[PDB]
């Protein structure tokens, strides 16, 4: 649509959004698969964080393809996860970083004042540091979650390391590229017609 | 025969701080459209004159 409303529900910056939109313009299909299943991947973290800002049918919720990982039983143990791209397709991995409105929230959720997030792959490397600041409210949030992504080539490995503030990948997409497809911005009605 | 087929082409999004790219992209599209419109119309006028003279 020329004016979509359902985009980022937990306000933040989407890194390289325009480049991703361009890359997804040649994708004809994909497999949505669970990259890091929440049920078995994090036994020592809470995988149930939600936000009112992502409310669905009246209940607080969160992004379907991401997990908000907060501490458990007063601790926030160091995370280390990896994935090997055995799909024989490029894989799009999405994740994010939480930037609390204040230090009270940072301690309450991650039990550290010095969290970091580190994501690497053979040809990718980023380290993120949460930047705590009280921001103007957007969708009632004084904090923010930024979103990041990368593509894995077949056979590579991606590693996620953190001691707090990570919004972990849950689902990822195995991208099958085609040709001649693209993205249309339009309000035209949909029908059962066929055209060349 | 001398005018080729138009193949899939879609627009691009740009950020707030990418205005110079946005403007170049538009400039390129408008320039090519203005040129092809010129060529299509001129060719038709030139050939319509010759057709009538031929007859």
């Amino acid at each position, epitope marked *: 649509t020329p004016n979509p409303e359902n985009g980022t529900c937990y306000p933040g910056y989407f890194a390289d959004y325009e480049e991703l939109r361009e890359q997804l313009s040649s994708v004809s299909s994909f497999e949505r698969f669970e990259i890091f299943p929440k049920e078995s991947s994090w036994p020592n973290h809470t995988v149930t964080g939600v936000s009112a800002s992502c409310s669905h049918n009246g209940k607080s919720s969160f992004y379907r393809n991401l997990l908000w990982l907060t501490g458990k039983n007063g601790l926030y143990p160091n995370l280390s996860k990896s994935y090997v791209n055995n799909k024989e397709k490029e894989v799009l991995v999405l994740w994010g970083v939480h930037h609390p409105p204040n230090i009270g929230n940072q301690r309450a959720l991650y039990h550290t004042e010095n969290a970091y997030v580190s994501v690497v792959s053979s040809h990718y490397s980023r380290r993120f540091t949460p930047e705590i600041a009280k921001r103007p409210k957007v969708r009632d949030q004084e904090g923010r979650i930024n979103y990041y992504w990368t593509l894995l080539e077949p056979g590579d490995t991606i590693i996620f390391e953190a001691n707090g503030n990570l919004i972990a990948p849950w689902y990822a997409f195995a991208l099958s590229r085609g040709f001649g497809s693209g993205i249309i911005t339009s309000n035209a*009605p949909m029908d059962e017609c066929d055209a060349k | 025969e001398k005018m080729n087929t138009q193949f899939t082409a879609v627009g691009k999004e740009f950020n707030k701080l990418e205005r110079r790219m946005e403007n170049l992209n538009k400039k390129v599209d*408008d320039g090519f459209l203005d040129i092809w419109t010129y060529n299509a119309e001129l060719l038709v006028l030139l050939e319509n004159e010759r057709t009538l003279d031929f007859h």
Partner: antibody
């Protein structure tokens, strides 16, 4: 020259369906390939778009009223029609029909409303 | 829906003066902006078609221009017959919208 003329009761009772007709002359709603619009103006307010119908019967509506609005078209008589179910006080307005014309531009056809009709005032009361 | 905001809501100026009415879109609508003149009791008349062009029959005193979001309607040498409400319309998206309108009073 192109002329549009709206017509209808001018008075509808609450919970009745309002039905207006626009007769198009000096043009052809089976040949032009244009969109035919309905708009309204509540007294004291600016203009609000209702919806439009194309030559192929393809119809779009203002999403705030889409559940109530029906728009149709009869090419044989050059007539457009508008129906609003469950009419209430909020629907008092001058209703207008309009022709949407165009000139090709950079970015596609650049559309505008040129022939606007006269306007029919409809009061909702009992 | 793309919102159109006009400013001022009301303007008065004497005959022969210059009137500038502006309109701001919430979204980039490129050149898809029409301007209309509404005399009391009548359907609106088209003045400006492309953001910068006139409809045949429109007096040369009317002009306008604009870019992505910021557009202007200008009346040079204002005459008594120019008393009207003026409206800003976008034709870029489907849920067509008009601004709230500007009432132009004379003197």
């Amino acid at each position: 020259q192109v002329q549009l003329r709206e017509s209808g009761p001018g008075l509808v009772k609450p919970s009745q369906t309002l039905s207006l007709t626009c007769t198009v002359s000096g043009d052809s709603i089976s040949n032009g390939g244009l969109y035919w619009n309905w708009i309204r103006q509540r007294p004291g307010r600016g203009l609000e778009w209702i919806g439009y119908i194309y030559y192929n019967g393809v119809t779009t509506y203002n999403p705030s009223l889409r559940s109530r609005i029906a728009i149709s078209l009869e090419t044989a008589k050059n007539q457009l029609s508008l129906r609003l179910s469950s009419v209430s006080a909020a629907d008092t307005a001058i209703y207008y029909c309009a022709r949407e014309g165009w000139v090709p531009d950079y970015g596609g056809r650049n559309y505008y409303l040129d022939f606007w009709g006269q306007g029919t005032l409809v009061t909702v009361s009992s | 829906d793309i919102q159109m905001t006009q400013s001022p809501s009301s303007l008065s100026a004497s005959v022969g003066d210059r009137v500038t009415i502006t309109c701001r879109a919430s979204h980039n609508i490129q050149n898809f902006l029409n301007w209309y003149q509404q005399k009391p009791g009548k359907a609106p008349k088209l003045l400006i078609y492309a953001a910068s062009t006139l409809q045949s029959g429109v007096p040369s005193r009317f002009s306008g221009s604009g870019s992505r979001t910021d557009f202007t309607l200008t009346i040079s040498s204002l005459q008594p017959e120019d008393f009207a409400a003026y409206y800003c319309q976008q034709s870029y998206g489907l849920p067509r919208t008009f601004g709230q309108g500007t009432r132009l009073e004379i003197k």
